RNA sequence: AUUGAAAGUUCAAAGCUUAGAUACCCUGGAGGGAAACCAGACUUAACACCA
């Protein structure tokens, strides 16, 4: 755990920016403007978040039969290139 | 009983192309195969005398 603003330099290295680049595919070389940049969130990174449930009978089902069931899911986009595989681990269990 | 409810910035995309670790460069200059060394040492034995 550092400092702010010791941290906020040390976690922007670790954040992925890639070029990336279109192909002329007879003469395989980039087009023009076929250049871009994109940012990435690393592998083994890891986000906090919650899901809040209203008293219900949907949601007694969906916490105990759908829920368990989640472990991994796909996020945001880019799945093509394989960037949307993440794992849910529900801190009920890892406590 | 909330200007509320509902909605995935998603999708397609090769950091690709061109490119000789090449060019100059005496293993050279200096350095005595020298220093020392007797071709020398010695007569013996037998013997007729002596004894």
Known sequence: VLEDS???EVINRSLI??????IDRDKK???TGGLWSEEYVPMKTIFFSVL???????SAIFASCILRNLRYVIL??????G???VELRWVKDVI
Do not use: A, C, D, Q
């Open 76 to 81: 945001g986009g880019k799945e093509t290139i």
């Open 83 to 85: 960037k949307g595989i």
């Open 17 to 22: 920016r890639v070029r990336r680049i279109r």
């Open 52 to 58: 809040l449930g209203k008293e219900s009978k949907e």
């Open 29 to 31: 070389v980039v087009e």
């Open 6 to 8: 010791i941290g906020r």
